[PDB]
Amino acid sequence: SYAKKPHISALNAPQLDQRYKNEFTIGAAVEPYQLQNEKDVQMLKRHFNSIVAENVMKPISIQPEEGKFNFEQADRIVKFAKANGMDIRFHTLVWHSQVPQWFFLDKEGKPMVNETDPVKREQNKQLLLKRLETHIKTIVERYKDDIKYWDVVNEVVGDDGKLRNSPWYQIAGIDYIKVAFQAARKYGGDNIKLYMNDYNTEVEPKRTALYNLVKQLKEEGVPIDGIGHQSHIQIGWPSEAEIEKTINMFAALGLDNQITGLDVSMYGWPPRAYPTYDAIPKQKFLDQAARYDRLFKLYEKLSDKISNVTFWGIADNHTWLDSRADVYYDANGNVVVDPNAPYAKVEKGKGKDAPFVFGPDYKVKPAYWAIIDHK
Ligand SMILES: [Cl-]
Ligand SMILES: [Cl-]
Ligand SMILES: [Zn+2]
Ligand SMILES: [Zn+2]
Ligand SMILES: [Zn+2]
Ligand SMILES: [Zn+2]
Ligand SMILES: [Zn+2]
Ligand SMILES: [Zn+2]
Ligand SMILES: [Zn+2]
Ligand SMILES: [Zn+2]
């Protein structure tokens, strides 16, 4: 939007959540250590009214061995949110990544996916489903009074438009999704809100597969209240038109929509990253600000169908996108960022992305001014 507008400390900037408070909550994803850092604490207090765990509420973080529950890290995020009046999202009860392998071992300690006996396969399904229910039961019995929004399952639809063929699906079929939602409703009650969370929700054939799956589950009475759109997006993709079509399509089913992991990468896919923040040209930040301007104008247009927009981080000094920021080098050792250009080697995850409206020094970016205004 504007470059006249100064690069001031975000701790002196108009509050993001208050700008959007009648449209949707504004959330940030966090690690417990950020709650012991003065600037991160002040950022959350000043700008955000919703919170989610980057990592410490994922399955392997909560029950790394059967019967060993580590709630200590998740508790710290819950305590902070309650003390500051923030909504909490739980990420996530079921996922094919960051998930302990003991879930999928049969009683003899062998991988359940290798079982060929159909009678044993059925016993493995029921055992996996029992373990799934106990994991969800224990978590929801602890947090049902504190955590309003739940990513019950994450990424269960494949990018090929089929259900994702994870061990969950190989072993139990579609019932693991039904069991997860039924268990969360049973032990959590009517007041927690249950979401199916995924990325590339705008992209066919994934989008229609997600649509059909949710429609079918709600016809069968499986409790599902909304869709989580991870929204790990780029400056130019996906188009605002396709985002709008997606949000409307699920709203038509009676589903809430939440933007659960928003970041606007500086790069394409696979990314060709700059090696450092300082090397990103100023024009990239202007392009990103214009993208954020259109994006939040669209969220506001659709505000009656969106209850929350959560960024997957606080400020540019910390983003999981850095793990994807591969730096490409030509034969002379110069950085290559042109997506089709010659190159000799790549340094995977060594570069720097810049996906938020707050810079790594906790000063506001052009993208912040683009979404704090009313134009
Ligand atoms: Cl991270
Ligand atoms: Cl800066
Ligand atoms: Zn306003
Ligand atoms: Zn606030
Ligand atoms: Zn630097
Ligand atoms: Zn709303
Ligand atoms: Zn992180
Ligand atoms: Zn992630
Ligand atoms: Zn700066
Ligand atoms: Zn604007």
Short mmCIF file of C-alpha atoms and ligand atoms in Angstrom, two decimals:
data_model
loop_
_atom_site.label_atom_id
_atom_site.label_comp_id
_atom_site.label_asym_id
_atom_site.label_seq_id
_atom_site.Cartn_x
_atom_site.Cartn_y
_atom_site.Cartn_z
CA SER A 1 0.00 0.00 0.00
CA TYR A 2 2.21 2.84 1.33
CA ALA A 3 5.96 3.37 1.66
CA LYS A 4 5.69 6.88 3.13
CA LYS A 5 4.42 5.13 6.25
CA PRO A 6 7.33 4.65 8.65
CA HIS A 7 9.20 1.53 9.77
CA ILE A 8 8.21 2.05 13.41
CA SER A 9 8.33 -0.45 16.25
CA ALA A 10 5.26 -2.69 16.15
CA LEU A 11 4.96 -2.14 19.91
CA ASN A 12 4.02 1.48 19.06
CA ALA A 13 1.72 0.59 16.19
CA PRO A 14 -2.10 0.44 16.07
CA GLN A 15 -3.24 -2.97 17.28
CA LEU A 16 -3.95 -5.52 14.56
CA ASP A 17 -6.62 -7.43 16.48
CA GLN A 18 -8.55 -4.24 17.31
CA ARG A 19 -8.58 -3.21 13.65
CA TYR A 20 -10.31 -6.50 12.79
CA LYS A 21 -12.23 -7.17 16.00
CA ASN A 22 -15.73 -7.18 14.46
CA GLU A 23 -14.61 -9.18 11.39
CA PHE A 24 -12.48 -12.04 12.80
CA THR A 25 -9.94 -12.73 15.52
CA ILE A 26 -6.24 -12.32 14.69
CA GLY A 27 -3.97 -15.16 15.81
CA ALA A 28 -0.30 -16.10 15.94
CA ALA A 29 1.45 -19.49 16.15
CA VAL A 30 3.99 -19.76 18.99
CA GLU A 31 6.60 -21.88 20.76
CA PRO A 32 6.70 -21.84 24.58
CA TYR A 33 10.12 -20.14 24.63
CA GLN A 34 8.64 -17.06 22.93
CA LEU A 35 6.51 -16.64 26.07
CA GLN A 36 9.74 -16.02 28.00
CA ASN A 37 10.92 -13.36 25.54
CA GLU A 38 9.92 -9.78 26.28
CA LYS A 39 9.37 -8.63 22.69
CA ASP A 40 7.34 -11.71 21.69
CA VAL A 41 5.22 -11.39 24.82
CA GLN A 42 4.53 -7.72 24.09
CA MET A 43 3.72 -8.53 20.45
CA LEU A 44 1.13 -11.12 21.51
CA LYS A 45 -0.37 -8.82 24.14
CA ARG A 46 -0.54 -5.86 21.76
CA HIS A 47 -1.60 -7.33 18.42
CA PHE A 48 -3.22 -10.76 18.82
CA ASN A 49 -6.35 -12.16 20.44
CA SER A 50 -5.95 -15.80 19.36
CA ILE A 51 -3.08 -18.28 19.73
CA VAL A 52 -1.99 -21.72 18.49
CA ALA A 53 1.02 -23.96 19.13
CA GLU A 54 3.52 -24.26 16.28
CA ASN A 55 4.54 -27.70 17.55
CA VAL A 56 3.94 -28.63 21.20
CA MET A 57 0.35 -29.82 20.73
CA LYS A 58 1.06 -32.20 17.85
CA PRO A 59 0.61 -35.93 18.60
CA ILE A 60 4.27 -36.81 19.08
CA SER A 61 4.68 -33.81 21.38
CA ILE A 62 1.73 -34.88 23.56
CA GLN A 63 2.04 -38.71 23.70
CA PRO A 64 5.53 -39.68 22.46
CA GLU A 65 5.18 -43.11 24.11
CA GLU A 66 1.87 -44.80 24.84
CA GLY A 67 0.69 -43.66 28.24
CA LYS A 68 3.31 -40.88 28.59
CA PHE A 69 1.50 -37.53 28.24
CA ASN A 70 3.61 -34.35 28.22
CA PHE A 71 1.14 -31.50 28.75
CA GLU A 72 3.74 -29.20 30.36
CA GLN A 73 4.57 -27.28 27.17
CA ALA A 74 0.98 -27.02 25.92
CA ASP A 75 -0.11 -25.90 29.42
CA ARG A 76 2.24 -22.92 29.20
CA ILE A 77 0.51 -21.69 26.03
CA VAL A 78 -2.93 -22.27 27.56
CA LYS A 79 -2.00 -20.37 30.73
CA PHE A 80 -0.69 -17.40 28.72
CA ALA A 81 -3.79 -17.25 26.54
CA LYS A 82 -6.16 -17.35 29.51
CA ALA A 83 -4.22 -14.64 31.34
CA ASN A 84 -4.43 -12.41 28.24
CA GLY A 85 -7.98 -13.21 27.08
CA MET A 86 -6.91 -15.00 23.89
CA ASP A 87 -8.82 -17.68 22.02
CA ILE A 88 -6.89 -20.95 21.70
CA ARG A 89 -6.75 -23.29 18.70
CA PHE A 90 -5.50 -26.85 19.26
CA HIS A 91 -3.12 -28.02 16.52
CA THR A 92 -3.65 -30.92 16.09
CA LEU A 93 -5.27 -34.18 17.28
CA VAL A 94 -4.47 -36.34 14.20
CA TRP A 95 -1.75 -35.95 11.55
CA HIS A 96 0.45 -38.22 9.44
CA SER A 97 3.53 -36.16 10.39
CA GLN A 98 5.03 -35.54 13.85
CA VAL A 99 3.10 -38.57 15.06
CA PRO A 100 4.54 -41.33 17.27
CA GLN A 101 5.24 -44.61 15.50
CA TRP A 102 3.92 -46.75 18.38
CA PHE A 103 0.39 -45.94 17.17
CA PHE A 104 0.86 -48.21 14.16
CA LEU A 105 2.60 -51.25 15.73
CA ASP A 106 0.62 -54.45 16.30
CA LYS A 107 0.67 -56.41 19.56
CA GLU A 108 3.84 -58.24 18.45
CA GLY A 109 5.59 -54.92 17.74
CA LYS A 110 5.34 -55.27 13.94
CA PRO A 111 4.12 -52.53 11.57
CA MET A 112 0.37 -52.87 11.14
CA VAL A 113 0.64 -51.87 7.47
CA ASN A 114 2.49 -55.13 6.69
CA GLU A 115 -0.32 -57.37 7.96
CA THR A 116 -1.85 -59.52 5.22
CA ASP A 117 -4.33 -61.58 7.27
CA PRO A 118 -7.74 -59.85 6.90
CA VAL A 119 -8.84 -60.98 10.37
CA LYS A 120 -5.67 -59.55 11.92
CA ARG A 121 -6.00 -56.43 9.76
CA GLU A 122 -9.42 -55.89 11.31
CA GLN A 123 -8.01 -56.39 14.81
CA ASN A 124 -5.30 -53.85 14.02
CA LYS A 125 -7.93 -51.37 12.84
CA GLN A 126 -9.88 -51.66 16.09
CA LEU A 127 -6.69 -51.38 18.15
CA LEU A 128 -5.55 -48.27 16.25
CA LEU A 129 -9.01 -46.73 16.64
CA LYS A 130 -8.97 -47.49 20.37
CA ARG A 131 -5.56 -45.84 20.72
CA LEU A 132 -6.81 -42.87 18.70
CA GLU A 133 -9.83 -42.44 20.96
CA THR A 134 -7.70 -42.61 24.13
CA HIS A 135 -5.24 -39.99 22.81
CA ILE A 136 -8.12 -37.64 21.94
CA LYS A 137 -10.02 -38.47 25.14
CA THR A 138 -7.09 -37.59 27.40
CA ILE A 139 -6.31 -34.32 25.59
CA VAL A 140 -9.90 -33.13 25.35
CA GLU A 141 -10.75 -34.10 28.95
CA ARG A 142 -7.89 -31.81 30.04
CA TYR A 143 -8.58 -28.79 27.77
CA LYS A 144 -12.31 -28.79 26.91
CA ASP A 145 -13.00 -25.80 29.20
CA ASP A 146 -10.09 -23.71 27.83
CA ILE A 147 -9.68 -24.45 24.11
CA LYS A 148 -12.57 -23.46 21.88
CA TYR A 149 -11.26 -24.39 18.39
CA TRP A 150 -9.84 -27.79 17.47
CA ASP A 151 -7.95 -29.02 14.40
CA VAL A 152 -9.36 -32.52 14.88
CA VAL A 153 -7.61 -33.87 11.78
CA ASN A 154 -4.88 -32.31 9.66
CA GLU A 155 -4.06 -32.96 6.00
CA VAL A 156 -6.19 -36.07 5.48
CA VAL A 157 -6.87 -35.37 1.78
CA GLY A 158 -4.08 -35.98 -0.69
CA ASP A 159 -2.94 -33.46 -3.27
CA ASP A 160 -4.01 -36.01 -5.93
CA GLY A 161 -7.63 -35.64 -4.78
CA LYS A 162 -7.71 -39.02 -3.04
CA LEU A 163 -7.71 -39.49 0.71
CA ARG A 164 -4.11 -39.33 1.90
CA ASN A 165 -2.74 -42.88 2.06
CA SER A 166 -1.07 -42.44 5.45
CA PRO A 167 -0.81 -45.34 7.94
CA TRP A 168 -4.01 -43.96 9.50
CA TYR A 169 -5.86 -44.59 6.26
CA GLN A 170 -4.04 -47.80 5.29
CA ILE A 171 -4.86 -49.38 8.65
CA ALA A 172 -8.30 -48.01 9.52
CA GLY A 173 -9.71 -46.57 6.31
CA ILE A 174 -12.00 -43.55 6.49
CA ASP A 175 -13.19 -44.51 9.98
CA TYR A 176 -10.16 -42.86 11.62
CA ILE A 177 -11.52 -39.48 10.54
CA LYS A 178 -15.03 -40.31 11.76
CA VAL A 179 -13.69 -41.66 15.06
CA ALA A 180 -11.52 -38.60 15.68
CA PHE A 181 -14.43 -36.15 15.33
CA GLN A 182 -16.86 -38.37 17.27
CA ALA A 183 -14.36 -38.73 20.11
CA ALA A 184 -13.65 -34.99 20.30
CA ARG A 185 -17.38 -34.22 20.45
CA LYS A 186 -18.02 -36.96 23.02
CA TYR A 187 -15.39 -35.91 25.56
CA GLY A 188 -15.45 -32.20 24.75
CA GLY A 189 -19.16 -31.44 24.56
CA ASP A 190 -21.25 -29.22 22.32
CA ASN A 191 -19.31 -26.01 22.95
CA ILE A 192 -15.92 -26.83 21.37
CA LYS A 193 -15.71 -26.29 17.61
CA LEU A 194 -14.22 -29.03 15.44
CA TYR A 195 -12.24 -28.40 12.25
CA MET A 196 -10.73 -30.32 9.38
CA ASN A 197 -7.46 -28.50 8.60
CA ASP A 198 -5.49 -28.67 5.35
CA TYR A 199 -3.27 -26.77 2.92
CA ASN A 200 -3.89 -25.97 -0.75
CA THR A 201 -7.61 -26.03 0.00
CA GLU A 202 -8.06 -23.81 -3.10
CA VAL A 203 -6.42 -26.26 -5.50
CA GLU A 204 -8.33 -28.78 -7.58
CA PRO A 205 -8.71 -31.73 -7.35
CA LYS A 206 -7.93 -31.42 -3.61
CA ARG A 207 -10.61 -28.77 -3.04
CA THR A 208 -13.49 -30.81 -4.43
CA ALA A 209 -12.22 -33.94 -2.67
CA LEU A 210 -12.25 -32.00 0.61
CA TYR A 211 -15.71 -30.68 -0.27
CA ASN A 212 -17.10 -34.16 -1.01
CA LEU A 213 -15.52 -35.70 2.09
CA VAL A 214 -16.92 -33.12 4.50
CA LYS A 215 -20.34 -33.16 2.83
CA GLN A 216 -20.48 -36.95 3.19
CA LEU A 217 -19.29 -36.94 6.81
CA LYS A 218 -21.93 -34.40 7.81
CA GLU A 219 -24.62 -36.38 6.00
CA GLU A 220 -23.56 -39.35 8.16
CA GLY A 221 -23.81 -37.20 11.30
CA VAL A 222 -20.08 -36.92 11.97
CA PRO A 223 -19.66 -33.67 13.98
CA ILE A 224 -17.61 -31.14 12.01
CA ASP A 225 -18.03 -27.39 12.46
CA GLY A 226 -15.55 -25.86 10.04
CA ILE A 227 -12.66 -25.99 7.60
CA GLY A 228 -9.16 -24.84 8.49
CA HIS A 229 -7.33 -23.23 5.54
CA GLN A 230 -3.60 -23.36 6.29
CA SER A 231 -3.09 -20.67 3.62
CA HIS A 232 0.62 -21.24 3.10
CA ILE A 233 0.56 -19.01 0.06
CA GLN A 234 2.69 -16.96 -2.32
CA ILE A 235 2.59 -13.41 -3.62
CA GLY A 236 0.82 -14.43 -6.82
CA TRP A 237 -0.75 -17.80 -6.05
CA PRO A 238 -3.48 -18.69 -5.36
CA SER A 239 -5.60 -15.96 -6.91
CA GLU A 240 -7.98 -13.99 -4.72
CA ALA A 241 -10.79 -15.25 -6.98
CA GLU A 242 -9.96 -18.87 -6.18
CA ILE A 243 -9.67 -18.14 -2.45
CA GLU A 244 -13.11 -16.53 -2.54
CA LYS A 245 -14.57 -19.48 -4.46
CA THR A 246 -13.12 -21.86 -1.87
CA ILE A 247 -14.39 -19.94 1.17
CA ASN A 248 -17.85 -19.62 -0.36
CA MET A 249 -18.01 -23.30 -1.32
CA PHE A 250 -17.48 -24.48 2.24
CA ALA A 251 -19.63 -21.73 3.76
CA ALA A 252 -22.45 -23.08 1.58
CA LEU A 253 -22.20 -26.39 3.48
CA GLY A 254 -22.83 -24.57 6.76
CA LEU A 255 -19.15 -24.69 7.72
CA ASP A 256 -17.14 -22.00 9.47
CA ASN A 257 -13.85 -21.07 7.80
CA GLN A 258 -10.67 -20.23 9.67
CA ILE A 259 -7.40 -19.11 8.13
CA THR A 260 -5.12 -21.18 10.34
CA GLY A 261 -1.50 -20.81 9.20
CA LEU A 262 -1.26 -17.74 6.98
CA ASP A 263 2.14 -16.78 5.62
CA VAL A 264 2.89 -15.01 2.33
CA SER A 265 6.18 -16.46 1.11
CA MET A 266 8.54 -14.27 -0.89
CA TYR A 267 9.21 -17.22 -3.20
CA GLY A 268 7.65 -19.64 -5.63
CA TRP A 269 7.63 -23.43 -5.40
CA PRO A 270 10.09 -25.06 -5.06
CA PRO A 271 11.47 -21.86 -3.51
CA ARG A 272 14.73 -20.27 -4.66
CA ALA A 273 15.52 -18.18 -1.60
CA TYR A 274 17.84 -15.33 -0.85
CA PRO A 275 20.53 -16.42 1.64
CA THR A 276 19.81 -13.66 4.21
CA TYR A 277 17.02 -11.23 5.06
CA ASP A 278 19.22 -8.30 4.08
CA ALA A 279 19.54 -9.64 0.51
CA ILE A 280 15.79 -9.54 -0.27
CA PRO A 281 15.16 -6.54 -2.57
CA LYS A 282 12.87 -3.75 -1.37
CA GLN A 283 10.52 -4.40 -4.29
CA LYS A 284 9.61 -7.82 -2.88
CA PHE A 285 8.19 -6.12 0.20
CA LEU A 286 6.10 -3.76 -1.92
CA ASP A 287 4.77 -6.71 -3.94
CA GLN A 288 3.98 -8.53 -0.69
CA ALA A 289 2.18 -5.50 0.76
CA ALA A 290 -0.05 -5.23 -2.31
CA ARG A 291 -0.82 -8.95 -2.00
CA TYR A 292 -1.68 -8.55 1.70
CA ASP A 293 -3.87 -5.54 0.87
CA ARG A 294 -5.96 -7.55 -1.61
CA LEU A 295 -5.96 -10.58 0.69
CA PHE A 296 -7.33 -8.85 3.76
CA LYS A 297 -9.80 -6.83 1.72
CA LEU A 298 -11.13 -10.21 0.58
CA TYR A 299 -11.18 -11.65 4.10
CA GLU A 300 -13.17 -8.59 5.18
CA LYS A 301 -15.60 -9.01 2.26
CA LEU A 302 -16.06 -12.60 3.46
CA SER A 303 -16.02 -11.72 7.16
CA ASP A 304 -19.41 -13.32 7.78
CA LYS A 305 -17.90 -16.68 6.75
CA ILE A 306 -14.51 -16.37 8.52
CA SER A 307 -14.15 -16.41 12.31
CA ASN A 308 -10.35 -16.23 12.61
CA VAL A 309 -7.22 -15.40 10.63
CA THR A 310 -4.09 -16.85 12.27
CA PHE A 311 -0.55 -16.16 11.00
CA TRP A 312 1.92 -19.03 11.35
CA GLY A 313 4.27 -16.91 13.40
CA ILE A 314 4.78 -13.51 15.02
CA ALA A 315 7.59 -11.66 13.20
CA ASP A 316 9.98 -12.37 10.32
CA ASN A 317 12.83 -13.43 12.64
CA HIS A 318 11.11 -16.83 13.11
CA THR A 319 9.18 -18.75 10.45
CA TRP A 320 8.98 -22.44 9.56
CA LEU A 321 9.25 -21.22 5.95
CA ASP A 322 13.00 -20.86 6.52
CA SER A 323 13.23 -24.67 6.50
CA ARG A 324 11.96 -24.50 2.90
CA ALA A 325 14.20 -21.58 1.86
CA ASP A 326 16.60 -23.46 -0.38
CA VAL A 327 19.46 -21.31 -1.71
CA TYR A 328 20.57 -22.09 -5.27
CA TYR A 329 24.15 -21.30 -6.37
CA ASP A 330 25.58 -21.14 -9.88
CA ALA A 331 29.03 -22.41 -10.83
CA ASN A 332 30.62 -19.10 -9.76
CA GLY A 333 29.01 -19.21 -6.31
CA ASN A 334 26.46 -16.47 -7.04
CA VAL A 335 22.92 -16.81 -5.72
CA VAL A 336 20.31 -17.91 -8.27
CA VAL A 337 16.70 -16.87 -7.58
CA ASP A 338 15.36 -17.04 -11.17
CA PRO A 339 13.20 -20.21 -11.08
CA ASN A 340 14.39 -21.53 -14.48
CA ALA A 341 18.01 -20.36 -14.46
CA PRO A 342 21.11 -22.56 -14.56
CA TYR A 343 22.59 -23.54 -11.22
CA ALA A 344 25.18 -25.96 -9.82
CA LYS A 345 24.27 -26.72 -6.20
CA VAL A 346 21.54 -26.05 -3.67
CA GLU A 347 21.76 -25.48 0.10
CA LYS A 348 18.47 -26.80 1.41
CA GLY A 349 16.78 -24.79 4.15
CA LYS A 350 19.67 -22.31 4.49
CA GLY A 351 17.97 -19.13 3.20
CA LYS A 352 15.54 -16.60 4.62
CA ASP A 353 11.85 -15.99 3.89
CA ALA A 354 9.90 -12.93 5.06
CA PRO A 355 6.21 -13.86 5.31
CA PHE A 356 4.62 -11.62 7.97
CA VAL A 357 3.61 -7.98 8.42
CA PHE A 358 6.26 -7.49 11.15
CA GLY A 359 9.96 -7.45 10.32
CA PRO A 360 12.66 -9.42 12.12
CA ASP A 361 13.53 -6.38 14.24
CA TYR A 362 9.86 -6.13 15.33
CA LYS A 363 9.24 -3.03 13.20
CA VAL A 364 6.24 -2.83 10.86
CA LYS A 365 6.59 -3.69 7.18
CA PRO A 366 4.75 -2.11 4.25
CA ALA A 367 2.40 -5.11 4.46
CA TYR A 368 1.34 -3.99 7.96
CA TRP A 369 0.29 -0.55 6.73
CA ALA A 370 -1.49 -2.26 3.84
CA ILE A 371 -3.79 -4.15 6.23
CA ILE A 372 -4.11 -1.70 9.11
CA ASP A 373 -5.73 0.97 6.93
CA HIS A 374 -9.29 1.14 5.59
CA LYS A 375 -8.50 1.33 1.87
CL CL B 1 9.50 -22.89 12.94
CL CL B 2 14.11 -4.68 8.80
ZN ZN B 3 -12.03 -0.11 11.44
ZN ZN B 4 -6.02 -7.22 21.98
ZN ZN B 5 21.63 -9.80 8.02
ZN ZN B 6 -16.29 -13.13 11.08
ZN ZN B 7 9.13 -22.29 14.99
ZN ZN B 8 4.14 -26.92 9.96
ZN ZN B 9 14.04 -2.95 10.16
ZN ZN B 10 -5.71 -2.04 2.85
#
